[PDB]
Amino acid sequence: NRRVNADRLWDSLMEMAKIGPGVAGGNNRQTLTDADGEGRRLFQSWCEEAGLSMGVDKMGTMFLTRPGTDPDALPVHIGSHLDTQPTGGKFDGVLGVLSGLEAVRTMNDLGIKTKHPIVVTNWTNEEGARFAPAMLASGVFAGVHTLEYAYARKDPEGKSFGDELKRIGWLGDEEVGARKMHAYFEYHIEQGPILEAENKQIGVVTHCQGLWWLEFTLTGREAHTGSTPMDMRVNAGLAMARILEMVQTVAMENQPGAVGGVGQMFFSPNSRNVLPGKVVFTVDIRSPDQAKLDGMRARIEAEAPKICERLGVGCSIEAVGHFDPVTFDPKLVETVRGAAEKLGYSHMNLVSGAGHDACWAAKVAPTTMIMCPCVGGLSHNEAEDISREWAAAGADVLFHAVLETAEIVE
Amino acid sequence: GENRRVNADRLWDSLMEMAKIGPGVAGGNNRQTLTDADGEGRRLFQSWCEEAGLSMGVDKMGTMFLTRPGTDPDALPVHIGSHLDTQPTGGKFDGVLGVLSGLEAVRTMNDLGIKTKHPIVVTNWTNEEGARFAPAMLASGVFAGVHTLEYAYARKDPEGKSFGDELKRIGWLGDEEVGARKMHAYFEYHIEQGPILEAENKQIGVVTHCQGLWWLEFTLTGREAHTGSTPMDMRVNAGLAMARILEMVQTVAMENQPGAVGGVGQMFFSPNSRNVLPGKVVFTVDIRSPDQAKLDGMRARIEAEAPKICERLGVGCSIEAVGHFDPVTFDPKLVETVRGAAEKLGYSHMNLVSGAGHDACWAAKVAPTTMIMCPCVGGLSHNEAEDISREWAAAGADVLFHAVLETAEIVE
Numbered sequence: 001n002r003r004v005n006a007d008r009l010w011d012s013l014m015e016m017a018k019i020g021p022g023v024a025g026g027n028n029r030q031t032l033t034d035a036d037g038e039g040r041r042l043f044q045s046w047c048e049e050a051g052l053s054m055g056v057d058k059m060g061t062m063f064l065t066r067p068g069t070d071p072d073a074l075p076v077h078i079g080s081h082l083d084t085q086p087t088g089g090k091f092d093g094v095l096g097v098l099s100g101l102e103a104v105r106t107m108n109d110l111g112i113k114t115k116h117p118i119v120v121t122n123w124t125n126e127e128g129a130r131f132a133p134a135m136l137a138s139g140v141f142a143g144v145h146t147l148e149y150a151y152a153r154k155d156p157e158g159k160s161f162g163d164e165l166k167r168i169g170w171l172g173d174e175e176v177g178a179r180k181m182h183a184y185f186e187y188h189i190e191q192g193p194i195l196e197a198e199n200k201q202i203g204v205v206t207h208c209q210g211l212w213w214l215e216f217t218l219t220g221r222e223a224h225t226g227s228t229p230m231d232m233r234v235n236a237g238l239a240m241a242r243i244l245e246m247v248q249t250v251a252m253e254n255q256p257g258a259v260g261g262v263g264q265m266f267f268s269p270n271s272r273n274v275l276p277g278k279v280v281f282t283v284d285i286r287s288p289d290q291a292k293l294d295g296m297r298a299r300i301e302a303e304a305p306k307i308c309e310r311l312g313v314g315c316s317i318e319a320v321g322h323f324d325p326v327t328f329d330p331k332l333v334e335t336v337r338g339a340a341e342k343l344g345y346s347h348m349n350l351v352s353g354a355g356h357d358a359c360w361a362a363k364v365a366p367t368t369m370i371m372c373p374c375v376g377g378l379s380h381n382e383a384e385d386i387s388r389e390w391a392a393a394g395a396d397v398l399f400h401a402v403l404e405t406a407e408i409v410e
Numbered sequence: 411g412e413n414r415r416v417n418a419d420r421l422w423d424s425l426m427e428m429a430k431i432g433p434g435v436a437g438g439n440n441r442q443t444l445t446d447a448d449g450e451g452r453r454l455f456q457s458w459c460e461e462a463g464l465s466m467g468v469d470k471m472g473t474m475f476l477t478r479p480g481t482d483p484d485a486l487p488v489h490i491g492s493h494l495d496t497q498p499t500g501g502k503f504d505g506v507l508g509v510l511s512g513l514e515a516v517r518t519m520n521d522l523g524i525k526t527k528h529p530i531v532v533t534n535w536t537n538e539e540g541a542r543f544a545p546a547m548l549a550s551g552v553f554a555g556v557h558t559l560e561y562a563y564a565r566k567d568p569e570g571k572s573f574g575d576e577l578k579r580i581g582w583l584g585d586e587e588v589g590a591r592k593m594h595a596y597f598e599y600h601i602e603q604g605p606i607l608e609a610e611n612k613q614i615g616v617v618t619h620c621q622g623l624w625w626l627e628f629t630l631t632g633r634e635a636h637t638g639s640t641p642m643d644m645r646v647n648a649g650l651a652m653a654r655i656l657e658m659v660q661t662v663a664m665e666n667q668p669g670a671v672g673g674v675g676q677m678f679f680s681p682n683s684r685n686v687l688p689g690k691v692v693f694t695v696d697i698r699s700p701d702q703a704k705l706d707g708m709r710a711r712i713e714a715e716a717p718k719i720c721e722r723l724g725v726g727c728s729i730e731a732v733g734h735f736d737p738v739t740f741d742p743k744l745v746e747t748v749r750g751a752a753e754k755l756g757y758s759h760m761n762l763v764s765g766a767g768h769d770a771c772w773a774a775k776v777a778p779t780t781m782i783m784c785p786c787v788g789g790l791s792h793n794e795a796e797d798i799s800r801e802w803a804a805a806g807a808d809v810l811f812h813a814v815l816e817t818a819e820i821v822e
């Protein structure tokens with residue numbers, strides 16, 4: 001029956017958006033920047049004012065706990081991320097974290113007690129923008145990455161994740177992944193166009209498509225772009241161009257349910273009149289179909305070296321991100337659907353297109369996701385947009401799904 | 411003639427000493443224009459020149475002019491010029507050989523007690539390379555009236571630092587009006603940066619021409635979007651447009667052989683996140699030909715096809731020329747002088763069309779100009795493994811020396 005405070009939630013989103021603003025009304029609040037520090041501090045202060053106690057793990061993940069009435073009951077987590085892309089929207093990650101805070105504030109308002117404690121979770125470096133892989137803290141949590149692997153990830157300026165975590169003062173004391181969860185929920189914008197296009201308020205997320213991030217390092221020969229005869233050039237840029245085209249072909253020949261593309265690129269030494277000695281870029285390929293994902297990976301890894309060999313270019317590939325398609329916990333999926341039905345919101349099943357911390361939580365606990373629409377499916381763009389009504393409806397569903405799972409006690 | 415030759419060892423030592431300033435990671439140099447290492451190199455060069463009796467002037471572009479007087483106080487100077495600034499992956503010999511061969515010619519004239527009618531001016535042009543700040547040949551460009559001082563000063567590097575502020579910072583903002591000097595003649599000695607002299611077993615390149623260039627900077631506008639969740643049919647992929655442009659440039663280059671090059675050395679994605687399609691992709695296409703019609707045909711074709719590639723993908727396309735000169739013909743009288751010097755000295759020689767751009771290309775606009783080349787191993791340049799021998803260096807310096815003496819005129 002009872003709804004969260006839509007205005008309080010919205011105001012919190014607008015306040016958090018002031019921290020680490022981008023250039024176009026979104027956010028550039030990347031993981032382990034001073035702006036990330038400030039956002040974490042603001043979130044902490046709100047949660048502490050709402051009666052939550054804070055724990056922080058050695059990956060900087062923040063766990064804000066509301067007690068249950070059963071002191072041995074495992075917690076129901078509500079998680080997402082406050083770190084953003086360089087061209088981040090105000091809603092990616094933030095909606096889920098702040099909807100957790102609002103769920104708690106509404107429980108406080110209504111004097112609600114639950115059997116299971118509730119833990120609002122802010123995972124470090126979900127985005128994998130500054131340091132790859134994405135979902136890095138939740139990955140250490142679920143036992144997929146070592147702490148030392150995570151700490152040694154570097155940004156483009158050669159700064160290491162571990163040192164930056166230490167720099168901004170968010171190194172916590174808890175062993176990563178020492179917490180066991182009764183259940184994990186994550187509310188997130190769709191980052192796709194389906195809910196909007198289908199006129200559905202709520203995405204009942206059943207699955208998440210898998211990914212490989214394959215980082216290519218191509219070795220060319222630095223040479224003068226003026227005086228070097230064409231047939232003596234070892235052109236790693238041209239090899240990269242052919243690889244990008246080949247990735248487009250691979251993605252298109254695996255439709256529907258496949259994507260492939262490149263967002264990050266570096267030439268060295270990156271002089272206008274020097275052919276690059278090194279060209280580094282990451283191919284992002286995804287599919288909800290396991291066999292398709294692995295076929296795309298195998299094909300790209302077989303074809304790309306041949307492209308390079310034809311040009312005399314060296315080719316090295318490193319996986320800097322990976323998870324197989326995820327199936328969310330079917331019982332919690334039904335809980336989400338039942339919450340939508342109880343509240344009178346339209347819903348449909350979705351397969352998440354993006355990766356989320358929920359994907360790793362799913363390895364160690366019953367996990368599901370809830371989505372609201374976003375305009376044009378636009379995300380990782382500062383123009384990312386949802387309405388107050390969209391935000392609120394999904395937060396209501398989160399609230400009720402959590403209450404059903406954590407169990408209201410009079 | 412017979413017997414007046416430069417000191418090969420002194421020249422070589424000077425190259426090896428200068429190579430210690432702003433070393434790269436593989437035995438070459440990363441001594442880019444208007445870095446502190448450039449400052450140190452300039453100061454070392456200055457001190458050597460001053461020890462050889464040369465007097466220094468510096469212009470507002472930081473170009474250094476080191477004068478050996480002549481016997482006629484109204485005679486205009488014969489310049490010997492090149493550049494001490496390097497690429498990030500620079501060789502020890504590109505630019506440096508020409509400047510230090512100037513110093514060596516002067517030291518040899520001093521050793522032999524030679525007097526000339528015309529003064530000799532060893533010239534170190536600022537920012538020939540156009541690595542850090544584009545265009546290349548920036549100071550010689552201002553000198554020859556191609557660029558305004560304010561255009562040059564406003565050039566920015568990838569860190570957003572401006573050329574004018576950096577020039578001032580390292581202390582090389584001089585007082586002379588740029589281009590106030592008139593030259594009787596200009597010579598530039600440079601490594602070939604191509605494989606021909608070595609392959610043809612020739613000691614000296616009698617440079618007759620320099621191939622022309624366009625540097626076309628593309629700015630492609632895509633739409634930032636999530637690389638996971640965005641359907642393929644909704645993507646506005648500026649990276650893919652760039653890939654197709656690079657491929658089209660390769661096709662253009664290959665269909666225009668022989669005597670054409672096209673390629674890309676510089677690229678930027680924004681925001682350059684692994685899971686964000688780029689909102690902006692910026693890169694520079696370098697196309698060259700010795701043939702004017704071919705050069706302009708390649709430019710017109712690239713500028714016509716690239717917007718079509720982009721339009722097919724919904725990508726915006728903007729093109730700016732950030733460097734250009736038409737093929738250069740060097741002064742025939744000075745070419746003959748160079749050839750005659752090689753013949754007098756008994757060096758094997760052949761004619762060359764320079765593949766690279768040089769400060770000489772702008773000097774040619776305002777004075778009788780030519781170039782001399784020596785071989786380099788495998789034609790490799792803009793790579794730290796750039797290599798010449800002591801003997802190659804010295805032979806070309808001898809030719810420079812004799813060409814300069816003929817032009818400046820020995821006075822007993």
Ligand SMILES: NCCC[C@@H](N)C(=O)O
Pocket residue numbers: 092093126127128134135353354355356638685
């Ligand atoms: N909001 C983030 C979406 C998940 C993402 N880091 C990814 O590349 O899948």
Ligand SMILES: NCCC[C@@H](N)C(=O)O
Pocket residue numbers: 226273504505538539540546547765766767768
């Ligand atoms: N330094 C020798 C090469 C000249 C160069 N600025 C070019 O791109 O042509």
Ligand SMILES: [Zn+2]
Pocket residue numbers: 081092093126188356
């Ligand atoms: Zn997210």
Ligand SMILES: [Zn+2]
Pocket residue numbers: 085092093127380
């Ligand atoms: Zn995101």
Ligand SMILES: [Zn+2]
Pocket residue numbers: 493504505538600768
């Ligand atoms: Zn040069």
Ligand SMILES: [Zn+2]
Pocket residue numbers: 497504505539792
């Ligand atoms: Zn050069």
